Design an enzyme around this catalytic site. Structure first.
Site, PDB file in Angstrom:
ATOM      1  CB  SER A   1     -17.980  56.518  48.620  1.00  0.00           C
ATOM      2  N   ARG A   2     -17.906  57.688  45.265  1.00  0.00           N
ATOM      3  CA  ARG A   2     -18.233  57.274  43.879  1.00  0.00           C
ATOM      4  C   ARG A   2     -18.318  55.904  43.237  1.00  0.00           C
TER       5      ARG A   2
END
Lengths: 51, 506, 57
Positions: free
Chosen positions: B371-372
């Site tokens: 996840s960024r």
């Protein structure tokens, strides 16, 4: 008991629709469409005269 | 039902008024129809992308306002429809009955209720394709949330507006991952906290209606339907319905989040939505694009996902975090729709085929998943104290990456392997069992501090349950604080160490 | 009330209220507890006195 009540309620609308089919068949079978033609003409006349 | 009679009278009165003010003399006549797309002449002044009301009863959107023949897809079955039937211009862009009242109701494409509960109130019926907030009306992910299932969630969070994505094979239960994620809207939403509220709204894009019933029952029994509006689009339902459904979910998300409360969404299997867009394009007249799928697949996917964001306090600091779910064939990460979407969504959680039968009911590829936003917008329990535990999660995942056929160079690698493997056998949060922000760090902390790692790997399947129950009924103050204080302090770390000694003992 | 013509919700609630005590608890341990306590306490006291005497010796 509640589920039976919910199912009977649905049966009520289903039976109402089934009798509505006969009710609609009555509308064509009876020549109230003659009594409906004048109403259609008047409603359309009013609609066109609206604007 | 006398109330049904009253409803019939009111609706027919509305119909009589409509007939009296028909204002439809040059409105279009459907020239031809097929495949849920109807080619209709006339309609000389129809505004683009406005619903058209058709005589056969089923309505549909008007997509391609071509020269003369304005193309309106049919959002319903064709056996009723026929060429030459009158086409009545609804005069409005496709708008969805939206508002807080839809709670617990399953609505059709535009929002037609389908469960059989009657009308649901509306707090606005906005168009299905709204323009998302730009830069200034947007903001960072400053408020975190919980994914519910540990589900590698403290590892890779899902914060305010974190547009995370998923993938999996057929019957991969990624839908179940979504359902468990939703169920976490019972440990915060079911209270009274708007700041903790994340009013989820699942979707049902192209699923067997039996699966829809399963979802509804699982929502009611665990008492989820109190907080989840599940817009539905049957496989038996028509293609335009399925295609427009994600737009309807977008509309619902706007109606919630735009009000200023932090809300969430989880689009259903969006691969079916893509197949629907394929049907809509390749069936009406539009030439196909890459991967034989319609050219604007990315456009549609973005216009869905890009609606989700986390606005600033200027817009109320609310957010509509989204978890779009895409499906592949053979768990194919490398595909047009999958890779293109993975560019659009900010987070990925890959579900494999082997692990889906190999070792975990979750079977989430921890290394593959990402996840960024790991730092900003993570469980303050999982980072503010257990940030070293997050780096240890990444490190142990890299460690297990090399654990295939290499020899035993030393004891350090072997110890890391055994402890991380016990951790992986632990971390799978059982289905429909969302219980998290209480002992998340505990697994890695005990592994490095040697509390669970000393237990047998297989026995952990009950040892974890016992440790949790001991924290609950014995470390109740410390566990409740870890739930509520928002951090696991060094003093709370020491008290949890004492509780860990107690768990190791009994 | 959700059941408009249940005609048994009255009866069901009647049975429910009349079934407030389905049965009683069973705290029949009133002499067995005493005898177990006597045996255990005498044995443990003998053990503790023996241990103290062993410590002294």
């Amino acid at each position: 008991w509640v589920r039976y009540e919910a199912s009977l309620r649905q049966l009520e609308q289903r039976q109402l629709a089934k009798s509505v089919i006969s009710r609609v068949q009555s509308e064509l079978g009876n020549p109230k469409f003659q009594e409906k033609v004048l109403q259609q003409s008047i409603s359309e006349i009013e609609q066109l005269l609206s604007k | 039902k006398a109330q049904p009679t009253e409803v019939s009278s009111i609706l027919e009165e509305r119909i009589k008024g409509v007939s009296d003010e028909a204002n439809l003399n040059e409105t279009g006549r459907v020239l031809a129809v097929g495949d849920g797309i109807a080619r209709v002449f006339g309609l000389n002044n129809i505004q683009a992308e406005e619903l058209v009301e058709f005589s056969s009863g089923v309505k549909g959107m008007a997509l391609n306002l071509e020269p003369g023949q304005v193309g309106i897809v049919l959002f319903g079955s064709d056996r009723l429809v026929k060429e030459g039937e009158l086409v009545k211009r609804t005069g409005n862009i496709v708008d969805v009955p939206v508002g807080p009242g839809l709670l617990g109701r399953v609505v059709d494409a535009l929002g037609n209720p389908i469960d059989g509960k009657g009308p649901i109130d509306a707090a606005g019926r906005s168009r299905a394709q709204v323009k998302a907030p730009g830069i200034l009306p947007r903001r960072s992910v400053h408020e975190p949330v919980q994914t519910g299932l540990k589900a590698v969630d403290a590892l890779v969070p899902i914060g305010r507006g974190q547009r995370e994505l998923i993938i999996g094979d057929r019957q991969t239960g990624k839908t179940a991952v979504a359902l468990d994620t939703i169920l976490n809207q019972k440990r915060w939403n079911n209270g009274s906290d708007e700041s903790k509220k994340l009013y989820c709204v699942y979707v049902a894009v192209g699923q067997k209606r039996s699966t829809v019933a399963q979802l509804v029952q699982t929502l009611e029994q665990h008492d989820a339907m109190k907080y989840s509006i599940i817009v539905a689009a049957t496989a038996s339902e028509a293609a335009p319905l399925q295609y427009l459904a994600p737009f309807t979910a977008a509309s619902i998300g706007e109606w919630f989040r735009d009000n200023g409360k932090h809300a969430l969404i989880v689009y259903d299997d969006l691969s079916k939505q893509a197949v629907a867009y394929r049907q809509l394009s390749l069936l009406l007249r539009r030439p196909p694009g890459r991967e034989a799928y319609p050219g604007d697949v990315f456009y549609l996917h973005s216009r869905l996902l890009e609606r989700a964001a986390k606005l600033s306090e200027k817009e109320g600091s609310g957010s509509l975090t989204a978890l779009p779910v895409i499906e592949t064939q053979g768990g194919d990460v490398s595909a047009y729709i999958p890779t293109n979407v993975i560019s659009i969504t900010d987070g990925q959680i890959f579900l494999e085929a082997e692990l889906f039968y190999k070792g975990i009911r979750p079977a989430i590829n921890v290394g593959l998943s990402v996840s960024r936003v790991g730092s900003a917008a993570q469980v303050k329990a999982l980072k503010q104290v257990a940030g070293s535990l997050k780096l240890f999660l990444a490190q142990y995942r890299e460690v297990a990456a090399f654990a295939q056929f290499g020899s035993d160079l030393d004891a350090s690698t072997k110890q890391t392997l055994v402890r991380g493997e016990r951790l992986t056998q632990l971390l799978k949060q059982n289905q429909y069992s969302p219980l998290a922000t209480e002992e998340q760090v505990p697994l890695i902390y005990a592994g490095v501090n040697g509390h669970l790692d000393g237990i047998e790997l297989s026995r952990i399947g009950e040892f974890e349950s016992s440790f949790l129950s001991y924290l609950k009924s014995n470390h109740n103050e410390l566990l409740t604080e870890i739930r509520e204080k928002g951090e696991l302090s060094k003093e709370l770390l020491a008290s949890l160490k004492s509780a860990t000694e107690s768990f190791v003992a009994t | 009330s959700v059941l408009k013509n249940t005609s048994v919700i009255d009866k069901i609630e009647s049975y429910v209220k009349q079934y407030k005590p389905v049965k009683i608890d069973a705290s029949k341990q009133l002499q067995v507890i005493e005898s177990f306590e006597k045996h255990a306490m005498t044995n443990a006291k003998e053990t503790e006195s023996l241990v103290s005497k062993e410590l002294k010796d």
